Amino acid sequence: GRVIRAQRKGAGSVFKSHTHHRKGPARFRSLDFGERNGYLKGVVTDVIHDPGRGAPLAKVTFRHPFRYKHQKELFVAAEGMYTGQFVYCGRRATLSVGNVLPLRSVPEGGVICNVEHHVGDRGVFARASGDYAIVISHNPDNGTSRIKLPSGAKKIVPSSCRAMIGQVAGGGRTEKPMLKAGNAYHKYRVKRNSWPKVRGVAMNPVEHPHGGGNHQHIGHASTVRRDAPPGQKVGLIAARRTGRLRGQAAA
Amino acid sequence: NPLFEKRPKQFGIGGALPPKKDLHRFVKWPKVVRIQRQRRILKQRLKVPPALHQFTRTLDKNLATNLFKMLLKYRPEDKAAKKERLLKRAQAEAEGKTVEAKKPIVVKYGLNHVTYLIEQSKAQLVVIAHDVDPIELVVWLPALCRKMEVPYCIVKGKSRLGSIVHKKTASVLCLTTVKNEDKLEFSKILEAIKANFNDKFDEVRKKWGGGVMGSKSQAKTKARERLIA
Amino acid sequence: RTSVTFHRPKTLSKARDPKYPRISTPGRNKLDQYQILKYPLTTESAMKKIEDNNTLVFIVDLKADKKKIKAAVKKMYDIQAKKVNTLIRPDGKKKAYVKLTPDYDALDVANKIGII
RNA sequence: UCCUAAGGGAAGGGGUAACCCCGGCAGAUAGCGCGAUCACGCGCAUCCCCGAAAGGGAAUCGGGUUAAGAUUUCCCGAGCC
RNA sequence: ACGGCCUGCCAACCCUGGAAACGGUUCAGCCGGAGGUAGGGUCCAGUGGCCGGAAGAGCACACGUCGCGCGGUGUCCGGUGCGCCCCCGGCGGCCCAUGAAAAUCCGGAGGACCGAGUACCGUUCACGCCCGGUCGUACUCAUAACCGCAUCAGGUCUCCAA
RNA sequence: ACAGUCGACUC
RNA sequence: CCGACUUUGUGAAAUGAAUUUUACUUAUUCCGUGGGUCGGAAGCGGGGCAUGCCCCUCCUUUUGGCUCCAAGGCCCGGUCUUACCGGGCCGAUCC
Ligand SMILES: [Mg+2]
Ligand SMILES: [Mg+2]
Ligand SMILES: [Mg+2]
Ligand SMILES: [Mg+2]
Ligand SMILES: [Mg+2]
Ligand SMILES: [Mg+2]
Ligand SMILES: [Mg+2]
Ligand SMILES: [Mg+2]
Ligand SMILES: [Mg+2]
Ligand SMILES: [Mg+2]
Ligand SMILES: [Mg+2]
Ligand SMILES: [Mg+2]
Ligand SMILES: [Mg+2]
Ligand SMILES: [Mg+2]
Ligand SMILES: [Mg+2]
Ligand SMILES: [Mg+2]
Ligand SMILES: [Mg+2]
Ligand SMILES: [Mg+2]
Ligand SMILES: [Mg+2]
Ligand SMILES: [Mg+2]
Ligand SMILES: [Mg+2]
Ligand SMILES: [Mg+2]
């Protein structure tokens, strides 16, 4: 056979990300003495649309701690933030939407976004539009906290991981039908070359395990094992179950 | 006078820009500096076996000034201090037809030479530098001098031994014979050296150095064990 | 130290003074005036330029620029160029149109060498 | 011609039997820049080169002139950088 | 072209003043006690008007003379637009799409440091002085100058458009 | 709510 | 995918005559910085109903302004020697 489409993506060539018009990475500011032991005051200057991303971005301008210059950071905007708002970052910051506090400063039940995982990774969790995490518990004899992620999983993270209060703005985006091949086309033009998709059953045997046959059908179980070689692992990888979700397994 | 006034700066965690204090602790150095500093630190942490921790116990400053006073007396003949006498003995040979210069007495150096003098028992005091690298050149000298029953000392600084003999580094010295004017001063020096070094040898061979953890680790160690108490 | 960043300390660089010259033989000026000005052009088009536009046309070296052409026309022919225009001809040689400053007369310069 | 785009090449370093393959991996990174000279000082942050005769961009117009050059390259006049 | 003077579009902006019986306004919108209507100003664009360039040029006539001769007459007046080409202004709509960078140039914050008035410290003004290097530049651009073995009914990116 | 002049276009 | 050995050191317990468990940091692996405040002790305020000896603080919450190259004090040392430069600490806690 020949190298199948799933295998061709790892080489990069035409499958790299489409990032000419993007506005830079979105993250917190490098954690320093100011944010560990108090609070640093920032002003939101613009709310901007970032191509390839549903969450809007907030340009926050801080004043440098020890140099005579500005420091211009870029956050994933929480719903509610507006231009001219003073956001506050640090350990002693108030519990307000748009503020960045460590999780030891957040009561259980709080809603949080852009949560760090390692102290200083500048944000890994709950970053898509309308997504948040919830603080479940604190364990003060470890310096760790349990949060619920958007997927529902419960992760133990340090008590110094920083998070932004509230939820990421732009929520509700995926509830709108697209109605058109054209609308899907413009969505992916600014993300990556993954659209449209030809069904493997419509291919020839030389380029896909599902290809070929006098009728379009798979002919073998579509669930493939976890340890299958690349070029063989197509379909439902390491699936624990198939079929329509009902009852407990839908929970 | 009434114009001169004071504008104290609120050098807080959100206030005025701080001044130029010393951040010598946090400077990110070149690799050559970086690796050498970690080299001493890693040495600290690991358990040094006795043969290598038999160093780390050097001769005192008080005794070294005493010993190095003697060695400075017996410096070998300088490069310049060596060509006029060969010039002078030309006439003694060319006319007098005799060489008459008598045995000049000085320290002996060079590792192979000193090892030779030790095993023939012509050595009376061995002086081993603590900082020879690679260390294997001298690790076994304490055992050989102890077995052959010659007093030996471990002074601090191979660069200093080399200075005596007019080299850059020397790594070992030994005095074979002193003049009849210094028997007393020589004897008193080597009495302590045998006591300091050749007496503890059979209990320092079973002493393991190293294992010292870091400052912040020890400050954490004490807190943990105090709560036990 | 106040800065956290270690830069490269700056030291002395000594200049070159070699113990023997790598080149003894001097440089001849291979683009002298005769190399620069090869020969005047006598095409009927050029002969027009002498009267109508107070101009002289030469075939010059391919490696001579407008500045050296101005110099060489003063050493040779002892005249002044108001303006020099050049083109590399389709067959590979460079041609220079020399305009004389209005003191000198191009026709009289043409006669003193022989073109007209 | 200058600048950068997508992108290419690339020094230390990593791999490689070698040809070659890797640029963010962070190394006293190449270049130091600026004020000075009558010497010293300051600062060094995401950093070299290439890459567009349709992108960005110091400055020109009218009138004449040839067998063949110029609408703005030559001549006349008038400007500009 | 360029140099001045005028004009000042549609927007934007300023000052006075205080709006219901609401008014101002577009083809559409929209605007107003966070200050409308009004009255009066500022600025902006211009490929707009006048003068200089510049009539000495060009063109059209009519003459008269040997050889890039010479002389003469003139180079006006209004009006029109769901017109066409280019460009611009200012609104509106669309997006799970929001539609380069750098070189380069301009402006500001701060104010360490600086000088005379027998005179020295200046100065992004006007005028005046010098210099401006290298390579391309002809011609075709196609039912014959390019590719298709050809002077091949094929193919090959543009600008002008009665 | 008149008088004068002008006016290219549509039904 | 899985095991042994190697990298690979340190020391503690329970069953055993090896197996799971644990603890250290310097190997290694990962992360973040223009390696820009880490550890310990102080100090400052605060809570006292054993004056405990301990705990909680660290000179910015405010409206889309601004924020550098230190004022000020003390002390050496030059000089005009009868008017002017160099330096040291504090300000900016110590180790
Ligand atoms: Mg595609
Ligand atoms: Mg699909
Ligand atoms: Mg499909
Ligand atoms: Mg098919
Ligand atoms: Mg197959
Ligand atoms: Mg099939
Ligand atoms: Mg079929
Ligand atoms: Mg079947
Ligand atoms: Mg040319
Ligand atoms: Mg270039
Ligand atoms: Mg260009
Ligand atoms: Mg261009
Ligand atoms: Mg001209
Ligand atoms: Mg008005
Ligand atoms: Mg105009
Ligand atoms: Mg005019
Ligand atoms: Mg058009
Ligand atoms: Mg618009
Ligand atoms: Mg041409
Ligand atoms: Mg042409
Ligand atoms: Mg044509
Ligand atoms: Mg061919």
Q: CA dist B166 to B125, B162, B171, C90, Å?
A: 20, 6, 13, 79
Q: Which residue of C has its CA nearest to B27?
A: C4
| Contact state of A39 with B14 under an 8 Å Cβ cutoff | yes
Question: Who's near A155: CB < 8 A, 6+ residues apart?
Answer: A117, A125, A146, A147, A149
**From the candidates B10, B13, B26, B227, which should be mutated to test the interface with A, based on the most A CB atoms within 10 A?**
B13
Helices B158-165 & B61-73, crossing angle to 10 degrees? 20
Which residues have CB atoms below 7 Å from chain E, the nucleic strand? Answer: A 20-21, 49, 51-52, 54, 173-174, 176-178, 182-183, 186-187, 189-190; C 62, 65-67, 70, 86-88, 94
In residues, how long is chain A?
251
How far is C-alpha A127 from the chain's CA centre?
Answer: 4
CB of C82 closer than 8 Å to CB of C100: yes
Are chains C and B touching, using the cut-off of 8 Å on CB pairs and a minimum of 3 such pairs? yes
Chains with at least 3 CB pairs less than 8 angstroms from chain C: B
Is any Cβ of chain B less than 8 angstroms from the Cβ of A66?
yes
**Structural contact between residues A127 and A74, judged by C-beta atoms closer than 8 angstroms:** no
For residue C13, the one-letter residue type is S
Name the nucleotide nearest C54; use CA and C1'.
D75
Q: Cα–Cα distance between B139 and B117 in angstroms, integer?
A: 18
CA–CA separation, B70 and B42 (whole Å): 37
Specify the experimental method: cryo-EM
Whether the bond between A140 and the residue before it is cis, its omega within 30 degrees of 0, is no
Q: Are A172 and A85 in contact (CB under 8 A)?
A: no
| Contact A/B (≥3 CB pairs under 8 Å) | yes
| A148 sits in which H/E element | strand A144-148
CA dihedral B109, B110, B115, B120 (to 10 degrees): -50
* Per-state percent for chain B, helix, strand, coil, to nearest 5: 50, 10, 40
- Whether the CB-CB separation of A147 and A136 falls below 8 Å is answered with yes
Q: Tell me the shortest Cα–Cα distance from B19 to chain A, in angstroms.
A: 9
Q: Which chains touch A (3 or more CB pairs under 8 A)?
A: B
Candidates B154, B165, B160, B162; CA nearest to B107 is B165
C1 touches strand D (CB under 7 A): no
Find where tokens 């990475």 sit: A25
Bases of chain G with protein Cβ within 7 A: 1, 9-11, 24-27, 31-40, 57-65, 67-73, 91-93
- Gap between the Cα atoms of C25 and A6, Å rounded: 70
DSSP 3-state assignment of B225? helix
Q: Report which of A69, A50, A67, A66 is spatially closest to residue A58, judged by C-alpha positions.
A: A50
Comparing C-alpha atoms, which of C112, C109, C106 is closest to residue C53?
A: C106
Best CA proximity match to B70, nearest among B182, B150, B172: B182
**A239 Cα: distance to centroid of ligand 17 (angstroms):** 59
Write phi, then psi, for A10 (nearest 5 degrees): -75, -10
**Proximity of residue C42 CB to strand D below 7 A:** no
Q: Is A235 helix (H, G, I), strand (E, B) or coil?
A: coil
By the CB < 8 Å criterion, does B17 face chain A?
A: yes
* Chain C residue with Cα closest to B33: C6
Greatest CA separation found in chain B?
97
Helix%, strand%, coil% for chain A, nearest 5: 15, 25, 60
- Partner residue facing B13 (CB), from A38, A67, A68: A38
Which of B14, B17, B18 comes nearest A38 by C-beta?
B14
User: How many angstroms separate the alpha carbon of residue A168 from the centre of ligand 5?
Assistant: 44
Residue corresponding to tokens 């948040």? A132
Q: How many CA atoms are closer than 13 Å to the CA of A118, on its beta-carbon side?
A: 3
The residue with tokens 């045997």 is: A205
Distances (CA, A) of B126 to B62, B129, B174, C61, C84: 18, 10, 4, 84, 90
Whose CA is closest to B58, among B176, B143, B137, B158?
Answer: B158
Helices (H), B125-176: 141-148, 158-165
Buried/exposed code over A84-110 (b: 16+ C-beta within 10 A; e: otherwise): ebebbbbbebeeebbbbbbbbbbeeeb
Nearest of B55, B58, B60, B59 to residue B205 by alpha carbon: B55
Residues of chain B with Cβ-Cβ distance to A37 below 8 Å are 13
Q: Hey, which residues does C85 pair with through a beta bridge?
A: C97
Task: Tell how far CA A47 is from the center of its chain.
Answer: 19
In angstroms, the Cα distances linking C100 to A81, B72, C36, C55, C115 are: 76, 90, 18, 6, 16
- Cα separations in angstroms, A119 against A29, A124, C55: 12, 11, 82
Q: Which two tokens stand for residue B209?
A: 């150095």
Q: What is the DSSP string of A98-140?
A: T-EEEGGGS-TT-EEESB-SSTTS---BS-STT--EEEEEEET
Q: Which of C40, C14, C64 is nearest to C113 (CA)?
A: C40
Backbone angles phi, psi at C83, to 5 degrees: -155, 140
Partnered with residue A112 across adjacent β-strands are A133, A165
Contacts of B18 in chain A (CB under 8 A): 66
CA C91 to chain centre: 20
Q: How many Å from the CA of B96 to C1' of G10?
A: 75
Closest residue of chain B to C9, computed from CA coordinates: B30
Q: Tell how far the Cα of A216 is from the centroid of ligand 7, in angstroms.
A: 7
